Amino acid sequence: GAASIGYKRESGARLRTTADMFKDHLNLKEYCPGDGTNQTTAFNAAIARAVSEGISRIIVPAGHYLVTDLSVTANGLVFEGQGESSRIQVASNNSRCFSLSGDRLTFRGLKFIGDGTASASANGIGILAGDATDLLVEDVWFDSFGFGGVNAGFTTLARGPKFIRTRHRNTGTGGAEIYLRGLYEGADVIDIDAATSNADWAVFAFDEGYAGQRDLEVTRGDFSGYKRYSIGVSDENPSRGFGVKINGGHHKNAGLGAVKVKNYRGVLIQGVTTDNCGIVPIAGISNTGESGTFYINSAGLVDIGGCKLRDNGMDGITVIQGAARNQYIVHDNQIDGCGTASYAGTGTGFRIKSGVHQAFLTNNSARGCTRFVAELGNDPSNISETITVIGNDFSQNLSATNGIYARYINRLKMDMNQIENTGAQVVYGLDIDTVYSGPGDRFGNNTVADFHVRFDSCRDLTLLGDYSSTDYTQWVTATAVPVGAKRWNGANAYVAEAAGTTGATAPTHTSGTVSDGGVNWRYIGKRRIAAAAVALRGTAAALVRMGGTTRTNSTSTAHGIDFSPSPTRWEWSDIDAGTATLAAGTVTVNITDNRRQVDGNYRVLVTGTVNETFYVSARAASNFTITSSNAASTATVMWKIFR
Amino acid sequence: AASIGYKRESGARLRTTADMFKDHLNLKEYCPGDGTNQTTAFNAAIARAVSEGISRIIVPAGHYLVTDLSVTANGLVFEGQGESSRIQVASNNSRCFSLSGDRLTFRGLKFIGDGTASASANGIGILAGDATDLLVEDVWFDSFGFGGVNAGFTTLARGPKFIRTRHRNTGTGGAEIYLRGLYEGADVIDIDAATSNADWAVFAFDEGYAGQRDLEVTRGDFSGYKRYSIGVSDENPSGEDRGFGVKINGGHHKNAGLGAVKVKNYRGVLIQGVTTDNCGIVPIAGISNTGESGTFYINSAGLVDIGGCKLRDNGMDGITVIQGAARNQYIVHDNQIDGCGTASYAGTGTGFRIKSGVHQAFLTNNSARGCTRFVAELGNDPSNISETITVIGNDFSQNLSATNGIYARYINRLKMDMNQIENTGAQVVYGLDIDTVYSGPGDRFGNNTVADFHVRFDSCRDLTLLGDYSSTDYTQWVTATAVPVGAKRWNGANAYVAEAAGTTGATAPTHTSGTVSDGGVNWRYIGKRRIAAAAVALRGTAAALVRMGGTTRTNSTSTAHGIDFSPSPTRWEWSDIDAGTATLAAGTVTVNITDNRRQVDGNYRVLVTGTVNETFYVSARAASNFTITSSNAASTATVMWKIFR
Amino acid sequence: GAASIGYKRESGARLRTTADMFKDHLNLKEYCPGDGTNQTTAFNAAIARAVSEGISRIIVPAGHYLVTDLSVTANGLVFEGQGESSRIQVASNNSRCFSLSGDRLTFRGLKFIGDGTASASANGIGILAGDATDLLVEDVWFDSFGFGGVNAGFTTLARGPKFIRTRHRNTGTGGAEIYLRGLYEGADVIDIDAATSNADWAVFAFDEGYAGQRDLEVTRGDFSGYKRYSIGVSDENPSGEDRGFGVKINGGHHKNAGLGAVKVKNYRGVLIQGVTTDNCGIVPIAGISNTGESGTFYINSAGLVDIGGCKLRDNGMDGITVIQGAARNQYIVHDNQIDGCGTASYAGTGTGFRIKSGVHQAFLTNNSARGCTRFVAELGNDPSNISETITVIGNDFSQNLSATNGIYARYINRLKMDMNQIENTGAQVVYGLDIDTVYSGPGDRFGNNTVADFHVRFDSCRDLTLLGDYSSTDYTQWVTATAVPVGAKRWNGANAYVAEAAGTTGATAPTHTSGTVSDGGVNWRYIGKRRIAAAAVALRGTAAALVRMGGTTRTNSTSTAHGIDFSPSPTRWEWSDIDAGTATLAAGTVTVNITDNRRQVDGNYRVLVTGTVNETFYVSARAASNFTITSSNAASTATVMWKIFR
């Protein structure tokens, strides 16, 4: 037949037959009809024929190949489908299409189809791999599998699989689209298209008892609607390599969150964006402290940056340590909404409980939190050592109860932070040995007649920041205001959303935007509602050190000081200074309004300009008197106020 | 051929040679590929593949002239074998394909147009309307009057994927990749885009359709586009649903007319690790002189995070982030500008432009060189007030051509620390109409280029200035002295740095630019020595509070004090100015204030207590000295004093 | 034969022959038997047939094609292998399989095999390229080549190659898997699989005398075992880099590298992000490692350096090294982590951060380092080239017990520091020498020595401002039968400990200087020494012109009560807000005690005081720990307010 029909492209070519042109390759339909019947025996023969002839690629043309648990133990084989019409279906309940042990296998251009049934994480699966190294899975569609697409496990260190542009649909309850087990290096998930209504995970990894290197790098996926996290990554026995890297992708509609990590040595999450994740809490999980669209638990190294997490139904970013030690950096992230699911004990922007790790919170911002914008430490069992806070913006969280909630910390460093119009207490610290809030810090503008900054049973406190209330300019009719200007009326404050001219309807609303007649005013918070700027409770502080940059002004009192258990030593440098001129041998000097004191126990220094003895005869909360030995004194004296 | 039997071995199926062919669909089974108009035959191949249930259509080497090939089915794979698999448009102002089918893919092809176009859906290789999961990979688009692919969407689905697409010779006003409507997961990976006439490489707009519009660009190559390489626009961003916006991850841009990236109203912008060179080099009248300037131009985005971007030889501005009139962070961090204003356009040449309005902005660990206008201008919109801009650890030094290092205006609160600006601007930092200014102890703004103020503030209410605003007191250039490389010496009005270690020659350096050799050492000009008229100056309406401390440096300018308050502040606090102990003689001492802390007047406060039973008082106070006298006209006591405001 | 057998899919299709269906493509086996014989003449005839027929793709089925120096000069060709059994082996020693000069060529799905021999960088190679622009090479395996897989050179600016998922094995002595020469734009190495025992580099690039743009981007490779650096990149004329940035490295994992993972010499731009390494720099080389060149990242004299998000574990020699000799853009090192250093015990070596910036303004932000010998971070330290500005923000260098210095700074003009955390590292936590201006903000914490030495020491520095916490931690004592939470810190003897678990104490005090040992009920981990420092702040060398401290400065709880050890005293010493309070006289005088933490080194400090009544008050005496206030009235019972400062 074909073996007797010679073929020659031109005279200079070899003399071959039309059969030779076909035999250079291996068409699957030389063995399989592709008519939707059970074809496992034919498929197995074609795999074995390629191995026997020394051929790698097996062309899978358009067809329907119903097939059960195919074993391939050879190495170089390429299963090259021509498109989504190259359909490979499971033929039985609770089974799979392929069982892989050969190395350097590659699947391409195929559509795998299941039957929606599964009796194990090793069934209801397109492909089960066991120590199949360097597995390449590219441009393949997994549809209607009871558990997922590929389950790859390893019992000895080797190259992990590469999933490039895999499509996953209709997976069903309790499933993982990609299931990695054991120890591996160089595993990659690139441009995944994951979307379900019932499956738990898109990418799941578990050690399965085996210890050692597990290098996974997920870049640029699309994850939709997974009931547990989109990417689940677990090591139960931490005890070479780095860990997991997540370089981007978009997540939405996830039930618990986008990323969960357990006990991995190193964690690198960069540029990930989520929306409406963690929107279905699970009783028995979400109320046990595990909450957050990022949930990183007991990792040796954590670096999450450039991540934009919007409308989180539960907590935002949660980084927790239990009981190797490396950095916890949370930098350049944004949280837009938190607690949209209205789950109790939930709605926190940043949950950083670092413990032995020295944490770094840098240049983050958060909006729309219902619990704490950032809670730091807060474990009576496991003390967090060092947490330093640089240049964060936790403003405009009117539904939060605390801007920063910090407890059970050894040293808390803060500077350049901006938190306005959030929380009953803007910053609330408890049981912290050493707190430092630099001059660049700004914590103020309450939502409730309470303390801007409160510290309970904290030993060493250095507070140099601006903890005042904003002394807003008042709202007036028929005055020119630019968009961004801030006026106050009654008990509230507002921002202009459009440059214009003031109407006659003075703003009175407590939420949203309302036109005053022409100008649109948006509510931002309350005006000077705080009961005090800096408050102390619990056991007495050993030291409270303030300076010339500390601002406690414009609250309900002139001083903004509320120490109910008084600190054993309260230092305050450069409170006030000036020059006065005596008359009839006396002056009573008025302290500037922003630095009026809580009592008259502050220290005063004074030296005169003439040969007279000057002394401080009285000290009040808002003034002090300087008298001279000359009852007719008219001299000038220079004075200084401090503690 | 249907009668010629074929069998691999005895255990295989008995098939014909025609059966082996019919498993696939060769396009040349219908199209001759000889350069003639073959739309009818091409359509029959497409229609045959759909009826046979075949996805892949193999497109061998050939020349296929084609016009408006409609495909509505979903499985099809148009698989060319390389660049000789040529598909040409066969009509003016038309296209090769019109797709509505989902999961389509094109591979290994070369599309050729005819340089003509009349609308964005003409002069196009492929038009797509609601064609979901479009993959377009390793295909070359050449000579298309408008562009390569136009993909639009009216309902939310998977956006297109363009992998290693090549674009050449497009044409005036064209866009290589047109994106319309709402979509998720759009990807442009490793694009090879270059023109002499086209306007954009990637252009995306809503066309009235609100919703999620997620586009990601990674590691492209963009050269020559007369507008921006990547332009992206939304008109109803409140309806952006469950999306984020635009992400740009790498790639190199060059020779762009206006810039590399333009964004308008997108809810989220992520630009990371992008490098440009010679971008913004062809200004356009009516655009470039209206405030739209900068090789990155981000206008009214809800969230902006650009980092690790290195922008070289910008013809206009560098990075511009502007707000009009949801409210999220503006982070510009770890970026670099090497040069600006190389086109010599008026009102143009600013390194950083951050007008953030309600957005809380962060400027952290950036650096800029070669700026001509401002190195960074913050706020500066009388209409729209910028709330908070905090500036940590930036390097704006060695911009000898800039008029200001930092020009800030119309901000409510400006927080700065750890910044380093030397040898830039007539005024290093110029603030106007700012309510609260904080400059931490790590801030260093000094070494003018003109006899002017290091740090000037106009009509600013609350000023806290704890940084080093001094002039560097360079040591003088000397002959026959060994200098290490990196050493700084002054001669005349100019300061210099050593390019090599060695021993100075005999001819003192007197140049105001470049590097000239003394007899044995090459000296590079770096700026002017102690030329400043003052370190800290105030103008406009009086400041309510000026607060300095023991770290504030105002020394070594033209004056000993470095203060120039033409409207004096209503309150001036300066703690820890000077202190010491003096021992009296004949009942008096006149103490000299330390050189670096000499004052502008004698209105500072003096405290002093004695060592013995005498009354001690301060009888005189001047700008540079003050006297302490005692009751005992023969006093020899030691007194401890302190100077402050 | 085949040309007379008609084929027709259906009535509506063209009537062709079975030969026409084959003549649409070009099967290589139409000219080559693939039987292991020398087939270069046949392979050349196959390539030439594709060119004259206008076909691009040449299908390479499973087979063994022995081949030598195949020249292809045409442009569109695609060499389309079918898998790893598509084997193209070199036929001669010291030779190559291909020599490319054509543009837009692509190789896909092949396995190239060498014979282990090489006599030059252009031999022992799978593919030599010369001005072969727009080269793509994807999913192809290079094995057993004497020098490497691809050597691509360029003499005029054009688009460099793209190596996508290329596998490299068994390259041998002194080779480089990928060799880029000359000037180019848009070169890419994506997802490389690189592993050898004998090769020097995975990716290497140098100018070869051609100045211009040399843009290279590496993304997400796998590198193991290379005797030099995994990625080596070099230029000798950098000023004329034309319209190009430099080299970008965006991830990948390196391991078992001889010298390091990345080397750069004189590139205008360097961008490294997200790279993780393990056990790199483990085979030092005499004549290199002991000449200053050390570090798994070694960036020498680059014009711009931004490295961030990199995690370097178990470095044999040095961590990140950034050096500049003698355009002038930023040096940013941020958000990086060193986990181990100096594991190879090589001399003069073990430093986590080596930053020699010179004219570049350097930034050290939010980095951490552990397990360092030598110095955790050494800044400047070049008697040649002064480092002009280095500013160090929010770094954590704590718990490097085996290091001699946390920070060793030298030959810097201006050193700015704040928000750093360095506890339990070094004989001196921070040691600065020959620095003109030093600033250490109130958020800095440098304390808890490992030697009876100085927490912070400065030699021959001119302007020093120290506002941070340089105290010894005053640990609470370990006591029997007291509940402790995990993370608590107690002391015993000369050592301090931290708890590994909550519970109640035992009855055997911790006496170990390493690791973890149970006391009976709780396991205590050794973390450092207790109050061992001789002084908090020390000054040597030429006298400082100014030492400025403030109310936030901490020098307490060391060996002495003051923490001061100025051997050449500074010409001016300002210390604001040392202490203050109110005293009440008795029999005319009081002697006020300075608080324990702020006890002074002498009685040369200043005192201010004013009284509450009409009496003349003065300070008749001042001692290191106390001063006396007396009045004119020898029966004074008056209250007086005072303040201590310098």
mmCIF file of C-alpha atoms in Angstrom, chain C residues 254-374:
data_model
loop_
_atom_site.group_PDB
_atom_site.id
_atom_site.type_symbol
_atom_site.label_atom_id
_atom_site.label_comp_id
_atom_site.label_asym_id
_atom_site.label_seq_id
_atom_site.Cartn_x
_atom_site.Cartn_y
_atom_site.Cartn_z
ATOM 1 C CA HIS C 254 20.858 30.003 42.523
ATOM 2 C CA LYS C 255 22.767 27.372 44.467
ATOM 3 C CA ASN C 256 26.256 25.895 44.895
ATOM 4 C CA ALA C 257 27.928 28.714 42.958
ATOM 5 C CA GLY C 258 31.693 28.979 43.274
ATOM 6 C CA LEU C 259 32.037 32.754 43.600
ATOM 7 C CA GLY C 260 28.453 34.004 43.524
ATOM 8 C CA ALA C 261 25.210 34.395 41.647
ATOM 9 C CA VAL C 262 25.624 37.771 39.887
ATOM 10 C CA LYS C 263 28.724 39.697 38.804
ATOM 11 C CA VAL C 264 28.547 43.096 37.090
ATOM 12 C CA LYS C 265 31.462 45.265 35.945
ATOM 13 C CA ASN C 266 30.834 48.810 34.699
ATOM 14 C CA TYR C 267 27.230 48.545 33.510
ATOM 15 C CA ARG C 268 25.351 51.835 33.353
ATOM 16 C CA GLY C 269 22.334 50.271 35.057
ATOM 17 C CA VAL C 270 21.823 47.266 37.328
ATOM 18 C CA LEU C 271 18.362 46.127 38.440
ATOM 19 C CA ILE C 272 18.174 43.006 40.628
ATOM 20 C CA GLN C 273 14.905 42.035 42.303
ATOM 21 C CA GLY C 274 13.455 38.915 43.896
ATOM 22 C CA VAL C 275 16.539 36.725 43.458
ATOM 23 C CA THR C 276 17.037 33.954 46.013
ATOM 24 C CA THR C 277 20.340 32.133 46.516
ATOM 25 C CA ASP C 278 21.528 29.263 48.697
ATOM 26 C CA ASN C 279 25.088 28.044 49.347
ATOM 27 C CA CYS C 280 26.628 30.461 46.845
ATOM 28 C CA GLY C 281 30.197 31.711 46.973
ATOM 29 C CA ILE C 282 31.358 28.406 48.475
ATOM 30 C CA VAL C 283 34.481 27.703 46.390
ATOM 31 C CA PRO C 284 36.930 30.613 46.758
ATOM 32 C CA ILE C 285 39.524 31.102 44.035
ATOM 33 C CA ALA C 286 43.036 32.277 44.859
ATOM 34 C CA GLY C 287 43.822 35.485 43.003
ATOM 35 C CA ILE C 288 40.170 36.589 43.024
ATOM 36 C CA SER C 289 38.470 35.996 46.373
ATOM 37 C CA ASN C 290 41.390 37.498 48.343
ATOM 38 C CA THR C 291 41.710 40.679 46.239
ATOM 39 C CA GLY C 292 38.498 42.374 47.397
ATOM 40 C CA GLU C 293 36.233 40.617 44.877
ATOM 41 C CA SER C 294 33.804 38.738 47.115
ATOM 42 C CA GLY C 295 30.052 38.393 47.430
ATOM 43 C CA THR C 296 27.320 36.271 45.875
ATOM 44 C CA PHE C 297 26.245 39.652 44.492
ATOM 45 C CA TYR C 298 29.369 41.479 43.271
ATOM 46 C CA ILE C 299 28.500 44.756 41.520
ATOM 47 C CA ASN C 300 31.653 46.674 40.584
ATOM 48 C CA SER C 301 31.573 50.292 39.373
ATOM 49 C CA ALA C 302 28.039 50.293 38.008
ATOM 50 C CA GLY C 303 26.470 53.691 37.419
ATOM 51 C CA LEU C 304 23.131 52.756 39.001
ATOM 52 C CA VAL C 305 22.351 49.918 41.416
ATOM 53 C CA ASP C 306 18.895 48.941 42.685
ATOM 54 C CA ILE C 307 18.743 45.569 44.444
ATOM 55 C CA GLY C 308 15.632 44.694 46.421
ATOM 56 C CA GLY C 309 13.616 41.753 47.650
ATOM 57 C CA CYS C 310 16.590 39.378 47.426
ATOM 58 C CA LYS C 311 17.087 36.607 49.996
ATOM 59 C CA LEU C 312 20.664 35.286 50.123
ATOM 60 C CA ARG C 313 21.121 32.213 52.329
ATOM 61 C CA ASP C 314 24.332 30.497 53.469
ATOM 62 C CA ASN C 315 26.838 32.571 51.531
ATOM 63 C CA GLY C 316 30.330 31.116 51.631
ATOM 64 C CA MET C 317 32.123 34.423 51.278
ATOM 65 C CA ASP C 318 30.237 37.737 51.170
ATOM 66 C CA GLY C 319 26.619 38.792 50.801
ATOM 67 C CA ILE C 320 25.853 41.838 48.657
ATOM 68 C CA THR C 321 28.906 43.788 47.495
ATOM 69 C CA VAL C 322 28.529 47.120 45.669
ATOM 70 C CA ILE C 323 31.792 48.895 44.809
ATOM 71 C CA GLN C 324 32.839 51.964 42.813
ATOM 72 C CA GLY C 325 36.322 53.064 41.768
ATOM 73 C CA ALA C 326 37.208 56.163 39.736
ATOM 74 C CA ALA C 327 27.154 57.893 35.562
ATOM 75 C CA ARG C 328 26.684 59.028 39.182
ATOM 76 C CA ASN C 329 23.207 57.720 39.962
ATOM 77 C CA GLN C 330 21.625 56.047 42.976
ATOM 78 C CA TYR C 331 22.827 53.014 44.930
ATOM 79 C CA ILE C 332 19.711 51.545 46.591
ATOM 80 C CA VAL C 333 19.885 48.336 48.625
ATOM 81 C CA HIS C 334 16.490 47.708 50.184
ATOM 82 C CA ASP C 335 14.242 44.946 51.541
ATOM 83 C CA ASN C 336 16.977 42.298 51.276
ATOM 84 C CA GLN C 337 17.893 39.487 53.657
ATOM 85 C CA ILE C 338 21.164 37.727 54.445
ATOM 86 C CA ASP C 339 20.670 34.458 56.327
ATOM 87 C CA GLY C 340 24.246 33.167 56.478
ATOM 88 C CA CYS C 341 27.709 34.418 55.649
ATOM 89 C CA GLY C 342 31.295 33.206 55.626
ATOM 90 C CA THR C 343 30.377 29.518 55.688
ATOM 91 C CA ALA C 344 33.526 28.685 53.686
ATOM 92 C CA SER C 345 35.716 30.210 56.449
ATOM 93 C CA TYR C 346 37.738 32.074 53.821
ATOM 94 C CA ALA C 347 39.930 34.816 55.258
ATOM 95 C CA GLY C 348 38.980 38.501 55.204
ATOM 96 C CA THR C 349 35.514 37.407 54.268
ATOM 97 C CA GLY C 350 32.057 36.910 55.762
ATOM 98 C CA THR C 351 30.470 40.337 55.371
ATOM 99 C CA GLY C 352 26.734 40.528 54.701
ATOM 100 C CA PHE C 353 26.610 44.052 53.232
ATOM 101 C CA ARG C 354 29.587 45.642 51.455
ATOM 102 C CA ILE C 355 28.630 49.128 50.244
ATOM 103 C CA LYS C 356 31.410 51.298 48.777
ATOM 104 C CA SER C 357 29.422 54.037 47.067
ATOM 105 C CA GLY C 358 31.872 56.855 46.321
ATOM 106 C CA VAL C 359 30.073 59.469 44.228
ATOM 107 C CA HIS C 360 26.786 57.530 44.323
ATOM 108 C CA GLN C 361 24.383 58.549 47.091
ATOM 109 C CA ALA C 362 23.695 55.212 48.786
ATOM 110 C CA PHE C 363 20.520 54.121 50.589
ATOM 111 C CA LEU C 364 20.243 51.155 52.983
ATOM 112 C CA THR C 365 16.550 50.652 53.767
ATOM 113 C CA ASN C 366 14.739 47.821 55.560
ATOM 114 C CA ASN C 367 17.402 45.142 55.139
ATOM 115 C CA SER C 368 18.265 42.403 57.615
ATOM 116 C CA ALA C 369 21.224 40.068 58.010
ATOM 117 C CA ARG C 370 21.922 37.036 60.196
ATOM 118 C CA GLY C 371 24.761 34.575 60.668
ATOM 119 C CA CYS C 372 27.503 36.980 59.602
ATOM 120 C CA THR C 373 31.130 36.675 60.536
ATOM 121 C CA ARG C 374 33.382 39.706 59.932
#
